[PDB]
Amino acid sequence: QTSAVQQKLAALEKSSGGRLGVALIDTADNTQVLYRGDERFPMCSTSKVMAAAAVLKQSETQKQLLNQPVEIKPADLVNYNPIAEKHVNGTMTLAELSAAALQYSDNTAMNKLIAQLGGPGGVTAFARAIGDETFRLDRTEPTLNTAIPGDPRDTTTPRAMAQTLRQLTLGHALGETQRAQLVTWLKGNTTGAASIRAGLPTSWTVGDKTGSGDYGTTNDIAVIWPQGRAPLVLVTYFTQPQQNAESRRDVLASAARIIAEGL
Numbered sequence: 001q002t003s004a005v006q007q008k009l010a011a012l013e014k015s016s017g018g019r020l021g022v023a024l025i026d027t028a029d030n031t032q033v034l035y036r037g038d039e040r041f042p043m044c045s046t047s048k049v050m051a052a053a054a055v056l057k058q059s060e061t062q063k064q065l066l067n068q069p070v071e072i073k074p075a076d077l078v079n080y081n082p083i084a085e086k087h088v089n090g091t092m093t094l095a096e097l098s099a100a101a102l103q104y105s106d107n108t109a110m111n112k113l114i115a116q117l118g119g120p121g122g123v124t125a126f127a128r129a130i131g132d133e134t135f136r137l138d139r140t141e142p143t144l145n146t147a148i149p150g151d152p153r154d155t156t157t158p159r160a161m162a163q164t165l166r167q168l169t170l171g172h173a174l175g176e177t178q179r180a181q182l183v184t185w186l187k188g189n190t191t192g193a194a195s196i197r198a199g200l201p202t203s204w205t206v207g208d209k210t211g212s213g214d215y216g217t218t219n220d221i222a223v224i225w226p227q228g229r230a231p232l233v234l235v236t237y238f239t240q241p242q243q244n245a246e247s248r249r250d251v252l253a254s255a256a257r258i259i260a261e262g263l
């Protein structure tokens with residue numbers, strides 16, 4: 001039970017020196033393609049989709065929540081804050097925080113989403129509420145990116161994340177307006193052109209959230225609207241043996257290319 005596609009992904013992984021995890025859902029026929037689909041990987045910033053979605057869910061019963069100001073203080077800045085540092089000693093709304101977290105991967109923005117949900121466990125609780133029994137968020141930014149091999153903290157599986165991303169962006173885990181907002185945010189991501197998108201035909205529309213961390217952890221989760229067919233959901237996770245390993249977005253592109261060529 002090893003397909004040509006899975007054999008190619010194994011070949012790619014071997015040449016990469018690291019560990020690769022892939023999960024595809026083709027929503028035309030609901031079929032799946034997985035590679036290490038039930039192994040755990042550090043999420044790094046791909047976890048920001050779950051936090052933003054959790055806040056969107058809260059906004060379904062609070063029409064003004066996304067307009068609520070949140071104070072940003074100097075002490076709130078962490079390792080990567082390109083948007084929040086512009087608002088120090090001021091405020092950002094929860095919408096602005098969601099956009100910054102998703103489209104620029106601002107880590108201070110993520111921490112405010114996590115706080116709005118009552119801590120990392122509030123993010124996990126939302127995951128469980130929408131059927132994901134695998135996701136776990138245990139820490140805030142920036143320590144949730146330590147990505148230590150064998151550490152279960154702040155991990156999920158490719159299979160679980162693909163399923164959840166489908167429910168969030170194409171399914172009914174969120175209200176219609178909230179689903180549309182999440183899709184809009186993902187489609188406007190600034191960080192993804194070298195990752196999954198780089199492996200797919202350019203005519204296709206992609207909405208994604210990247211992740212980066214220690215152990216050269218390089219991730220991307222995407223919803224894809226190909227030319228001429230139903231949407232796809234694709235998760236590509238990659239992590240390496242050495243703590244100081246360099247980013248390998250090319251490996252994610254290569255995985256996406258193999259998946260696309262298998263359609």
Ligand SMILES: *[B]([O])([O])[C][N]C(=O)/C(=N\OC([C])([C])C([O])=O)C1=[C]SC([N])=N1
Pocket residue numbers: 043044045046079080105107142145146210211212213214215
């Ligand atoms: B998320 O995974 O996109 C947040 N990423 C990080 O905090 C890390 N790097 O982010 C920048 C600075 C944008 C990058 O160079 O990829 C990070 C945390 S630990 C590590 N080695 N890099």
